[PDB]
Amino acid sequence: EVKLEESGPELVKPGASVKMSCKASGYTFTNYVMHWVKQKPGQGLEWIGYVNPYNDGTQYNEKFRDKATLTSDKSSSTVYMELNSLTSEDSAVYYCTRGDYPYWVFEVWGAGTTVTVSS
Amino acid sequence: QMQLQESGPGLVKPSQSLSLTCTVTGYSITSDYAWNWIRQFPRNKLEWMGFITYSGSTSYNPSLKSRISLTRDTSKNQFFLQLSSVTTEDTATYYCARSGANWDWFAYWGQGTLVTVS
Amino acid sequence: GVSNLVGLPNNICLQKTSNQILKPKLISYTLPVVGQSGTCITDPLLAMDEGYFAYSHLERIGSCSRGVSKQRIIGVGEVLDRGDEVPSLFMTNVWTPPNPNTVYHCSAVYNNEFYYVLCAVSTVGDPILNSTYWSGSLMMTRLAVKPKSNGGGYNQHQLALRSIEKGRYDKVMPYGPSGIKQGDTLYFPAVGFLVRTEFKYNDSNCPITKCQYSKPENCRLSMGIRPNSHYILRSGLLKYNLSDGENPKVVFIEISDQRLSIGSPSKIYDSLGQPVFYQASFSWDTMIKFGDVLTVNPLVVNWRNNTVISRPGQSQCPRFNTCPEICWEGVYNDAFLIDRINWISAGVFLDSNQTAENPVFTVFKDNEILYRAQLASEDTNAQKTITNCFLLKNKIWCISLVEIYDTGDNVIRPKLFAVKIPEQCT
C-alpha cells in the first residue's frame, strides 16, 4: 500500500527553524515526486512545492521560495522540509503528497503534521 | 493519343552539338510520367540515355553523363535532347518515348529520326 | 491545432508498465496511388516545427541502392488534425530539384513561415564516402509552409550561398534531418571534414579501462569511415543568421570534445523551451548519444547517461557495445524528449542485436525503459527512424518515420506512425 507518514506535531518558538520528515513506503520511492502543501486551520490549502527524488529536483512557490527548502534521500526513502525564521503566522498543518498521473495530482496524502509557532 | 514526333538535323558534324527535339501531341508534359530519349544503333542495339520527369527532374545514363542534357518547354509542351562532342559512333536512330504507369517501361514511342555523323 | 511541446506534463503515463498501453496509428502524408509499384524510397527527411513539417525523399526505380533516381521531393506542409483526433501530415508546397542524383544529406529548419532546407550538391557521389573529391557545394531552398496562389519567389526560392565560415575544417556539409531556430538564426545539424593529420586527440583520454580487447588508438582511427581515411568527421551545427546581411555567412560550430565520436546524422530540436542534441552512434559507442544543449555557440552538449537504449550495429560493433573498436556502422534512431522533469523521451528504436529490424516505439527514462510497442513484426527490417513529438489539442503526439521494408510489398516506402502518449497508465 502506498503510505506516506509525517513526522509528529512540532512546538516551535518564533525565530527558530523546524525540519519535518515524511517517510514513503510500499513503492519505488525514486519514481514519483513528492509535494509539500500547507493548510492553515480554518483556511484553504496552499501548495508549497515539490521535490523529485530521482534527480533531487525541487521547485517552490513564489511565497515559499525564501521560506522553505526541500531535500530528499533514497537511502531512507524519505523527504525532508526545513523552514527558517518562522513568523507566528506559520501555525499550520503540512501534508506530504505523492504526485501521480504525471506529478501534479495528489492522490496519496500523508497524515499531516502540525506545527505551532508561538512563545 | 500522345503521338510523340522527333525532329532535328539528321547530319551533324563530329565534335559538335547534337540537338534534337520531341513534341508531344494530345497530352501535357508537365502533368505526369517521364519522357525518355532512347537511341538505337545500326546493329539494332537499343540504348537508354535518359529521361526528364514531369516536375523537371532529369535522370541520365551514367556512361553519357558528361555530355547529355535533357531540357523541357512547358509553353510549347516539348522536350529537347542535347549531346556535346558527338563522335563517329553516335550515329543512331533516336526515339522519344513516354515512361509507363510504373515509369520503368516505355509505353508509346516516337517514330524516331536517324542521325548520321559524317 | 498542432503546437510545439511546452508546459508541464499533464494527463499521460510516465511509469513503467508491461501492458499494451501504446496505440500507434498508420498515418500518411499522401494517399497511395492505386495500381502503382516498383519503386523504392530512400534518404527520407522528416522535420517538424510549430505545426509545420517538411519531408524529403529520393524515389528510385528498381534497386533500392543503385537504381535510376525517379525523383527527389522536398515538400513542406501543415500538420493538421485528420478528423478523428489523430495528426497526419498534409503537404502544401512541393519542389523537385532538376538533378536528383547530386542532392545529398538535406537538413531542414523552420523560421517565420518559411522552411529552409540545406542540402549538399555533389557530382562525385555521396560526400561522406568519397569526400576527398567532393567540391564542398551546398544549397539552400526556401519553401513556404503557406503558399499563396501567385507568389513567385515566395513559394519556392533558392538562396545563393556565398560566404562559408568553417575554420580549421577542410569542408562542411549538413548531416542531419532537423535543426532549430534561435530568433533569426538557423542551426542545422552538420558535419565537418577535417584532415586526419591535424586531428588533436589525446590517446590516453578515451576510456579503454573496462575492455581488454581495445588498443587506445582505436578511438582516433574510429573517428573516420576508414582507419586510413583522409578526413575525420566532426559533428556540430551550421549557423545561418538571416539578418547578417545580403549574403549571410554559414558558420560551422564544432561539437564539444566531451564524449567525442564520429560525425553521424545528428539533430537538434527545441523541446520544452530548450535545445536537445542527438548525435547518432555510427561508431564503437552504441548507446544513444543525446542530451541537453548548454550553449548553441559553441556547441556544448550535456549528454544523457543512457544505459538501456542502444542501436543495432553489424559485426564487431553490436548493440550495447561500449569498447572502442574500429567500426563505422550504425543506424539513425532518434529520440524526442517529452518530459524535462525526469528526462523521459520517446522514439522508435530497432530491437535486434546484429540486424537492423524490429522497430519498437519506446518511451524510456535515462536508465529504464517505461513502455514499448511493436510497430511491425519481429523480423520486419527497418533502417532509420525519425521521431518528433508535439501537442495536438493538449495531447502529446509523436509522429515517427520508419524505414520499414516489410515483406510482401511491391513498393518500398517509409511508414508514418502517429503514437499518442497515452492518458491513462492502465
Added chain:
Amino acid sequence: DIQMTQSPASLAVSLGQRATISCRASESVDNYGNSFMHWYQQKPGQPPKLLIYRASKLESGIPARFSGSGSRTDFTLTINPVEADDVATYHCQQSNEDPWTFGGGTKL
C-alpha cells in the same frame, strides 16, 4: 551496368509453332519481389512496341499468345502460335539498376 544477352540471335520458326527466346541478365533484376524485365517488339521501319511489362503482364490490346515467364537471371518469351505478323526484332530490357540497358536483337 547489367549486360544483357538474349538467345538465339538467329531464330526461324514455322507457322503454328511455339517460338522460345531466352534472355540472360548478368546480375539479378528481382529485388523486392518485383521483376524488372520488359519485352519489346520492333517491326522493321517501326518503333519498338511494348509487349510484356514486368516479365509476366500483358500490355493492353496486345494478343495473349505472347507470354513472358522466368525470373531472377533467366527470362523467357514464348509465342504460341506464330502467324505472319511476328517478323520483327525482340528486345529484353532490364530496369533494376542504372542504366536501363536493353538486350540485343532476335531476327525472327
Added chain:
Amino acid sequence: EIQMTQSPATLSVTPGDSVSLSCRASQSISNNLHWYQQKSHESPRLLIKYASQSISGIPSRFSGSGSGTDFTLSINNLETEDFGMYFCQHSDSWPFTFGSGTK
C-alpha cells in the same frame, strides 16, 4: 498565479439531493484541475483528476465537468458521508493554487 475561486462559500444540502459546486479560474486552464474532499481533522482525499476522470475507490456519484474557466463538480443521491470541505487545484501554471473552499 491563477486564482481558483470556489462558489458558493458555504452550502446546505439535505441528504438525497444533487448539488453542483463551481470552480472558476482567472486565466484559462485547459482541462487540468482536480477535485479533492477533506473531512474534519482528516487529510484531503482525491475525488476527480483532470476535471472529468474518476479514480478507484470512489463512488460514481462524484462527477466532474467543464473546461476552460468554469468547472463543475456534481454529486447525485448525496448521503451523510459526503459532508465536508471540497477543493479544486489547477496543474498547468507552475504555482498550483487551491480554491477558497465549499461546504
Added chain:
Amino acid sequence: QMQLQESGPGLVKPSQSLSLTCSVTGYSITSGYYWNWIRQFSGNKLEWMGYINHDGSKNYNPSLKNRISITRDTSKNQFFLKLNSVTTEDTATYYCARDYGSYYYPMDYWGQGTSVTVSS
C-alpha cells in the same frame, strides 16, 4: 572583419633575399584559411607564389620551389615571404591573400599589395 597589410623593402638589390611580412588583423592564422602569396608582374599577369596552410603545411609553385619560403608567426599573427635569390624579373607587386584552397567557396580576400622594385 579582417585586414591584410604587406610590409617590406620596396627597393631590393639583385641576387639578394627579398622579405615581406603580411600582418593580419581581425583573424587567426592557426584557426582558419589558406594564406597565399601571389605575385603580379609589370605586365598585368598574376602568378601564384604559394601558400602556407593554417596547420603549417607549406605549398610552393614548382617554378619557384628552389627560392621561396613562406613561414609564419602566430604570436604576431603574420606571415612572411622570403625569396632567396631575386633577379630583375621579380620586379612586381606582391599580394597576401586568404582563401579556402580548392574548396567550392574560396572567398578570396586580397591585401592591397606592395610593389617591390628590383634594380641597381
Added chain:
Amino acid sequence: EIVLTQSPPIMSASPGEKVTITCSASSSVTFMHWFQQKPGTSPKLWIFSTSNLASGVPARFSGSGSGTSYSLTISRMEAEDAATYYCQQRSSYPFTFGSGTKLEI
C-alpha cells in the same frame, strides 16, 4: 602546370551591349574562378566556382562553361565594369591566371 588562356586579350565593349569573355584551359578543370581587377586596386573574386556570383557582384554577371572552356557573361554592361578579368583554376597545383581588359566604348 595547366595553362589557361583568355581568347579576346583586349576585348572592347560599347556600354549596354551583351559581352562575353572566354577562358580556355590546357586540360580538364572542374572549377574556374573569375577575378576582377581595376588599376591601382588588388584583384577581387568576382565569380567563384563556375557560375556562382561572389558577394556584392551585380546580377548582370553570369558565369558559364564546362570542361576546359568557361565563359563570363554580362547581359547589360555599365560604366563600372571596365576592369581586367582573370580566370583561375584550382583543380591541380599550381594555380594559374590569364589576362584581358575592358574598354568604355
